[PDB]
Nucleic acid binder design. Sequence first.
RNA 1: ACGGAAACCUUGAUUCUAACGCUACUUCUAAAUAAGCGUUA
Length: 105
Amino acid sequence: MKNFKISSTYRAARKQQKTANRKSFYNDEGYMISPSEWADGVIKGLINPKNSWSNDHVKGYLPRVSPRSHWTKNGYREYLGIGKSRDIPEKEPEVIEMMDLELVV
RNA sequence: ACGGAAACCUUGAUUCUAACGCUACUUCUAAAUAAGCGUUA
């Protein structure tokens, strides 16, 4: 994930909805566990501490992610993925002949 | 040195002929190999 970054609106929403203050923890099978047993499993090695917790939920359907920018050769700004998005029109499509087909109104 | 001696209750005979442990009965009834994708970036 390099073309996009975390949006500032979502970061502000998460910050002052305090969703990181209400984390949920999981064991290696992805089942909700109390923070005490999560700590005990992480210390024992039975849980990977990295991918085993969630930052609650942010409400309001905000865009989580915004395009990231970089510097072109002349010092102008540009979106990272705008210019290397595509080069060929992928050929396609295929026009299948299906004149014998009863459509439904 | 006896109402005593001698004398097979014996011979020949198939407990045999005929007869289906048989008639009827669905291993049957419902059921998508399918559901969840969070949070961080």
